[PDB]
Design a protein around this ligand. Structure first.
Ligand SMILES: C[S@+](CC[C@H](N)C(=O)[O-])C[C@H]1O[C@@H](n2cnc3c(N)ncnc32)[C@H](O)[C@@H]1O
Ligand SMILES: C[S@+](CC[C@H](N)C(=O)[O-])C[C@H]1O[C@@H](n2cnc3c(N)ncnc32)[C@H](O)[C@@H]1O
Ligand SMILES: [Zn+2]
Ligand SMILES: [Zn+2]
Lengths: 268, 258
């Protein structure tokens, strides 16, 4: 039920191509995703998130350190969605560590994983068949209005209007971002005085906060795992050698995680 | 000296904004920079950390020379392309106290930082695609590692004006890329040419550096080949208390035909 990245009209499908009323065709890569981006802009980049690191976030998550969060969302959905659900969408579905679990937990429905990392989507789509992965910029969702029963937003940004447009009325939106104390001990190894900042409750014109939770728990990280984790965080470069030397030789590093989950309904 | 990102016409500077005979709105932010626009912050920051540690001071030093040496009493304007957060621009601005030093970049976060830190430089945010200035207004345009069609170069530059570019030479950061390369081959970068301009001087500037693990990491974060670096390579380099690598800077002094 995609929309045309270009004319924004329903994408009708023929075998393995998507075509819109005005003859815009998008083919499916051999793996199964649907590229939906332009032809040659900014694709050329300044990564940070290229194959190397994707394999990291991935390899890190495959240790399930974050599974609690997935479990939380999965159950969250297993509950709100009724038996009249057709499909859910996962904005920012990276290589789909989280999404494939949602799908495996919602068989009767179609699971979509949108992300903007071609390299990521490729990896996802190849590993997880139970998900229809599409590759595009979510500044304007690649879906027809009122087409989704729920949308999962795990730390990936999005506009309110698009939420209102794509989500059926009575539908859901589930968002999860880091909480104040998320990964303190780590930030504790590199900052002058660690400033945790108290997040203001946000709002989605069009929805209703039906539940707000917090999920905090401690992780016993091994040397590598820690460094690995430090490696994929905004501050990584403030870590002076000493930090990495110790953090890496550390038998067990202790770090707590604090995620902030939300759950709104698309008003009827 | 600006030029409408809209009607491509002159710009009236009235108090804290600019407009033309077109009701086209472009105002001045609280920091002093102007946005004529129709990476992250941790890096603009990590970059500035590295640049301020003074490892590219030589480069800034030499370019300043070029300027002090070529512009005369009649100079007035001097645009810097890709000015980022002002690390080099301002240095010029000082050196040239009689002319106006403009600094441009497409990075608000970065521009803003400089706008706020370097007051002796009129900064603005826009693309390098079409220079935000009127024809033949600049007396010199500095272009350290920035892209810019030679046409805009020629159009905005007063005749007999100058263009100073700075780009990586054959050996630039060898050792770095030597860390993330099976084969150590990266042959002769050739012919940067500027139609409409006549090369007046070419210089190379190579000197060794003694970087600290994090400095190396930040530098690699500024490098085009970074995306190739494996994790083990990032962790390792970061752990090294002292990493050694050379610099290879090519500098061209182009003069605008009369
Ligand atoms: C709210 S937490 C933040 C994690 C990290 N500790 C940090 O400081 O940014 C969820 C993170 O998991 C990652 N994520 C979400 N979906 C993913 C996917 N499908 N594959 C790989 N990573 C994913 C994102 O980088 C996101 O920031
Ligand atoms: C002189 S450095 C050479 C380092 C280069 N990244 C390398 O591969 O070794 C050139 C880089 O610095 C940027 N630059 C010049 N001035 C800057 C400023 N004031 N703030 C941020 N970046 C700046 C250029 O646009 C370019 O990306
Ligand atoms: Zn179309
Ligand atoms: Zn105009």
């Amino acid at each position: 039920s995609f929309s045309c990245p270009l004319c924004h009209q329903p994408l009708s499908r023929e075998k393995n191509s998507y075509i819109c009323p005005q003859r815009h065709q998008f083919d499916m890569a051999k793996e199964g995703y649907v590229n939906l981006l332009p032809v040659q802009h900014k694709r050329s980049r300044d990564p940070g998130d290229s194959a190397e690191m994707m394999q990291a976030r991935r390899a890190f998550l495959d240790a399930g350190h974050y599974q609690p969060l997935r479990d939380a969302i999965v159950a969250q959905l297993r509950e709100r969605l009724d038996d009249k659900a057709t499909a859910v969408l996962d904005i920012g579905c990276g290589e789909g560590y989280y999404t494939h679990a949602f799908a495996d937990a919602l068989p009767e429905i179609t699971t979509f994983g949108l992300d903007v990392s071609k390299v990521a989507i490729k990896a996802a789509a190849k590993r997880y068949p139970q998900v229809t992965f599409c590759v595009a910029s979510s500044h304007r969702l690649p879906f027809s209005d009122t087409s989704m029963d729920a949308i999962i937003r795990i730390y990936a940004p999005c506009k309110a209007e698009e939420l209102a447009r794509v989500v059926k009325p009575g539908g859901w939106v589930i968002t999860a971002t880091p909480g104040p104390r998320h990964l303190m001990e780590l930030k504790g190894l590199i900052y002058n005085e660690v400033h945790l900042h108290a997040p203001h409750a946000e709002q989605l014109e069009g929805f209703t906060l039906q539940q707000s939770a917090e999920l905090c728990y401690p992780m016993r990280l091994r040397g590598d795992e820690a460094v690995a984790l430090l490696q994929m965080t905004p501050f990584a470069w403030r870590a002076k050698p000493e930090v990495w030397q110790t953090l890496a030789a550390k038998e067990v590093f202790d770090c707590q995680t604090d995620f902030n989950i939300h759950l709104w309904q698309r008003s009827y």
